[PDB]
Design a protein around this ligand. Structure first.
Ligand SMILES: Nc1ncnc2c1ncn2[C@@H]1O[C@H](COP(=O)(O)OP(=O)(O)OP(=O)(O)O)[C@@H](O)[C@H]1O
Ligand SMILES: [Ca+2]
Lengths: 140, 372
């Protein structure tokens, strides 16, 4: 596991800044032809506008600073999301997003000490409600 | 241009081809044949063996064998012949010039993965090769790394939970019933309807019937009743000479066997129950996402209405407040092969191959380390 697409310079800086909580949201995309991971968006995003960030017509990777209280503690925990809207994506788009995931997570972890608390795979991010996200990170 | 080969070896059929093509170029039976008795056969040629289509045509002269039983390779002498035949006869390539991706079944012994790589390097002299789990390739192709794949091919049906690219071997269910069993039951009950199919020329004809007319009922007894008391759902089938026979409740009774294996005697849970059990053997936690991501692969999941039926059955077995989805891609018949082609065609895949140097230095395995 699995296939490592070079993460662009720009992208790597966004992720780094997320690791230091200077950014709260970093969205990446794969350039299929170039076999490359490139920076799509770093628009400052609160939980309540996260759904709007998730494209409904192509697949994306997301790293999102999830600010929330857990039984006494305010936690600002990094969540990873792989979003995939369905057959609007080509097989090749689906295989690459699926296949290029683990190595991307490996770099962020070993080099940026990102502390990815949870990874989530979703269809559209209507799903990404307040209670959904709390249940993912803090199950029962 | 050196070009990578991709091979998906199944119990019934070999799908083979070039990485980057979007469909497998060679699809032919995983059948090896050898002279029926000892002395001089007629007309055995100047040859000790046949593979694939030729082996079918000369069935009367040969003893036919499947080297892959239930996804696993059990006859290595015969498996070598299928590979040889795939390279030289089907693909027209010289194996030594080409990186080869190969696929493997659930619950495949580690020793088997090793002899597989061993043979590729020692006997076929591939410069590089690599091995991928079928179920994982299909999951990944559907655009997800976690879910439960229901792979149903020609001789085996597997339920395989996968977490984050990794199959959970302890939760993998195996069910020895698939396409070849379904063609034969269609043959049986079609002959009971008063026609006659015994007979290997006829088995072919029934395979085409099965593959073009069959469907899975949403509600089986509804449909049996809807057929007994009306000629509503009767498709006519053109025999290849000109006769025309009429096919009725067989049309859905045949793949019903998947959910109701008692139909062919066998005491065993159906595909819905096995996929429930598989799930149930996992984390209480992970279960949520298994249910939400049931992916289907393999030719025996190609029946119309199979997706919906699963939806019905799974729901009926699940906690009432469970989010259940089945994903049944249009490409699912060769999704395993398509996924390898996509992978083996990427420049960034050049440094993922196991090489001859790596294998020499050594040896076979290399495979468990470098591929997963
Ligand atoms: N449209 C269809 N409807 C029903 N069955 C089909 C269809 N197309 C192919 N099949 C059946 O699927 C089987 C072949 O599928 P597949 O190639 O996935 O199996 P395999 O890889 O050879 O076997 P296994 O995975 O069990 O080892 C055959 O029995 C074939 O008749
Ligand atoms: Ca198969």
């Amino acid at each position: 596991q699995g296939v490592a697409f070079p993460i662009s310079r720009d992208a790597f800086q966004a992720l780094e800044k997320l690791s230091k909580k200077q950014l709260n949201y970093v969205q990446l995309e794969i350039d299929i032809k170039n076999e490359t991971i490139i920076l799509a968006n770093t628009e400052n995003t609160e939980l309540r506008d996260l759904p709007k960030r998730i494209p409904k017509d192509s697949a994306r990777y997301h790293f999102f600073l999830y600010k929330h209280s857990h039984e006494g503690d305010y936690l600002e925990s990094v969540v990873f999301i792989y979003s995939m809207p369905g057959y609007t994506c080509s097989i090749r788009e689906r295989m690459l997003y699926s296949s290029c995931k683990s190595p991307l997570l490996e770099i962020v972890e070993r080099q940026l000490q990102m502390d990815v608390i949870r990874k989530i795979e979703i269809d559209n991010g209507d799903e990404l409600t307040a209670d959904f996200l709390y249940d993912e990170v803090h199950p029962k | 241009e050196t070009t990578a080969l991709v091979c998906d070896n199944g119990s019934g059929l070999v799908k083979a081809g070039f990485a980057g093509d979007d469909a497998p170029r060679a699809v032919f039976p995983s059948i090896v044949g050898r002279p029926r008795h000892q002395g001089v056969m007629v007309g055995m040629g100047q040859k000790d063996s046949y593979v694939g289509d030729e082996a079918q045509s000369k069935r009367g002269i040969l003893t036919l064998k499947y080297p892959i039983e239930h996804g696993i390779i059990t006859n290595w002498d015969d498996m070598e012949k299928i590979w040889h035949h795939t390279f030289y006869n089907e693909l027209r390539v010289a194996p030594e010039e080409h990186p080869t991706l190969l696929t493997e079944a659930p619950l495949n012994p580690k020793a088997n993965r090793e002899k597989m790589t061993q043979i590729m390097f020692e006997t076929f002299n591939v410069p590089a090769m690599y091995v991928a789990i079928q179920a994982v390739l299909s999951l990944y192709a559907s655009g997800r790394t976690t879910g439960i794949v229901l792979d149903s091919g020609d001789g085996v049906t597997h339920n395989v939970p996968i977490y984050e690219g990794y199959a959970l071997p302890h939760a993998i269910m195996r069910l020895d019933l698939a396409g070849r069993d379904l063609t034969d039951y269609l043959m049986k009950i079609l002959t009971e309807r008063g026609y006659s199919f015994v007979t290997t020329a006829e088995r072919e004809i029934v395979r085409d019937i099965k593959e073009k007319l069959c469907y899975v009922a949403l509600d089986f007894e509804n449909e049996m009743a809807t057929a007994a008391s009306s000629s509503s759902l009767e498709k006519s089938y053109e025999l290849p000479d000109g006769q025309v026979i009429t096919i009725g409740n067989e049309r859905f009774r045949c793949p019903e066997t998947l959910f109701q294996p008692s139909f062919i005697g066998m005491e065993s849970a159906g595909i819905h129950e096995t996929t429930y059990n598989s799930i149930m053997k996992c984390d209480i936690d992970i279960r949520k996402d298994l249910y939400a991501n049931n992916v289907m692969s393999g030719g025996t999941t190609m029946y119309p209405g199979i997706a919906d039926r699963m939806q019905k059955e799974i729901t009926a077995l699940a906690p009432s407040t469970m989010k259940i989805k089945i994903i049944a891609p249009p490409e699912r018949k060769y999704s395993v092969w398509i996924g390898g082609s996509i992978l083996a065609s990427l420049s960034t895949f050049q440094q993922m191959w196991i090489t001859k140097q790596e294998y020499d230095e050594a040896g076979p395995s290399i495979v468990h380390r470098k591929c997963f």
